[PDB]
C-alpha cells in the first residue's frame, strides 16, 4: 500500500537520523586502555575519551587529534587522514544528508504533484549511507595510527547505514510506482 510504504519511509528516515545523531554525539565509539587526563579502561568516541575505572572515572579528555609527541608529525597522507578523522566530516555529512532526505520526504506529502522530490530523497538517503561507509572506514583506519572493543555508538552508526539504505530503496520504489501510475493515466 502507498500509505504503508510512506509510513515505513518516514519512520525509517527518522530512526536512521536519530541513530546517527546519537552516534556522532556520544562517547562510546570504542573501548580501550588509555589515559583520561592530559593504563586504565576507557570509553572513547569521536571527540572525547573517558575512563570507566579509577579516581578519574567519569572525567573526559578531548581526543588528541594531532599528537605531536608520539608520532611527531608524519607524511602528507597521514596528516590528511588525521584531518579527516578529526573533522569527522563524513559522519556529519551523513547526518546532514539524512536530514535533507527527511525534509524532502516531508515536503513531498504537501507537494504531491511534484515527482522528483521522492527521487531526490532516495538519492539523499543512498548518499548518506555511502558517507556512513566512508566515515566508518576513516575512523577504523585512523584508530590504527592490545585489545579493543567497539561500543554501541559505532553499532548505532552501522544500523543507521543499513536503515538509510533500506529507506532509499523504499523511496526509489515509491518514485517508480508514481511514474508507473502517471504512465497508466497517460495510457487511459
Amino acid at each position: 500500500d502507498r500509505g504503508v510504504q510512506m509510513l515505513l519511509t518516514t519512520v525509517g528516515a527518522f530512526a536512521a537520523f536519530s541513530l546517527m545523531t546519537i552516534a556522532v554525539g556520544t562517547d562510546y565509539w570504542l573501548y580501550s586502555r588509555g589515559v583520561c587526563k592530559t593504563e586504565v579502561m576507557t570509553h572513547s568516541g569521536l571527540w572525547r575519551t573517558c575512563c570507566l575505572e579509577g579516581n578519574f572515572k567519569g572525567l573526559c579528555k578531548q581526543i588528541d587529534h594531532f599528537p605531536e609527541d608520539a608520532d611527531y608529525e608524519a607524511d602528507t597522507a597521514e596528516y590528511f587522514l588525521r584531518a579527516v578523522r578529526a573533522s569527522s566530516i563524513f559522519p556529519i555529512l551523513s547526518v546532514i544528508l539524512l536530514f535533507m532526505g527527511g525534509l524532502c520526504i516531508a515536503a513531498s506529502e504537501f507537494y504531491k504533484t511534484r515527482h522528483n522530490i521522492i527521487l531526490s530523497a532516495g538519492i539523499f538517503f543512498v548518499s548518506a549511507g555511502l558517507s556512513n561507509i566512508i566515515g566508518i572506514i576513516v575512523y577504523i583506519s585512523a584508530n590504527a595510527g592490545n585489545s579493543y572493543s567497539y561500543g554501541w555508538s559505532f553499532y548505532f552508526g552501522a544500523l543507521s547505514f543499513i536503515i538509510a539504505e533500506m529507506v532509499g530503496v523504499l523511496a526509489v520504489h515509491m518514485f517508480i510506482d508514481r511514474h508507473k501510475q502517471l504512465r497508466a493515466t497517460a495510457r487511459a
Binding site: 532516495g122 555511502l130 561507509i133 543499513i162 539504505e165 530503496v169 518514485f175 508507473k180 504512465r183
Partner: protein, 149 residues
C-alpha cells in the same frame, strides 16, 4: 588454538563488516541506477532490464563469490557499478586467498576440525532455505483456500 570459524582468520573483523556494508551499498546503487529512470520502463510496465533490488543483490553476491549469474548490466552507470565491484572483489578475494595460504603454511593434510564451521554454516543455510520455502508454500495454500471460499 584456532576455533571452528578459523577460516575467517586471514581477514580482520572490520574488513568482514565493511565487506557486508559494501555489498549492501553496491547492490542498492546497482538497483537505483538500473530502475529509477522512467525512461528505462516500456509499455504495470516492464523494465528494459532485470535489475531489481533482489536481482541486484543476487548479481553482487555471484560476482563476489566468483560464480557469476544469468544477468549483466547493459547501461553505462550499471556497468560502472559492476566494474568497480569486480575490481573490489578481485582484490579482496585474492588477498584472502594469499593470506590463507600464508596461514596454512605456519605438508600436513587439513583435518575436518578446521572446516567444521563452514559445514555448520552450510547445513544451517540449507535448513533456513527449506523453512522459507515451506512458509511460502503454506502462505500460498492459505491464499488459495481463501480464494476458493
Amino acid at each position: 588454538k584456532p576455533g571452528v570459524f578459523s577460516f575467517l582468520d586471514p581477514l580482520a573483523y572490520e574488513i568482514w563488516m565493511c565487506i557486508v556494508f559494501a555489498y549492501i551499498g553496491v547492490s542498492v546503487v546497482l538497483f537505483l541506477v538500473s530502475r529509477f529512470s522512467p525512461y528505462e520502463w516500456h509499455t504495470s510496465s516492464e523494465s528494459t532490464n532485470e535489475f531489481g533490488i533482489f536481482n541486484s543483490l543476487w548479481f553482487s553476491l555471484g560476482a563476489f563469490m566468483q560464480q557469476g549469474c544469468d544477468i549483466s548490466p547493459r547501461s553505462l552507470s550499471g556497468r560502472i557499478v559492476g566494474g568497480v565491484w569486480w575490481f573490489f572483489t578481485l582484490i579482496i578475494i585474492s588477498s584472502y586467498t594469499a593470506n590463507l595460504a600464508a596461514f596454512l603454511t605456519v605438508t600436513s593434510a587439513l583435518s575436518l576440525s578446521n572446516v567444521a564451521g563452514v559445514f555448520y554454516i552450510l547445513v544451517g543455510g540449507l535448513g533456513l532455505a527449506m523453512l522459507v520455502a515451506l512458509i511460502e508454500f503454506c502462505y500460498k495454500s492459505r491464499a488459495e483456500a481463501k480464494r476458493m471460499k
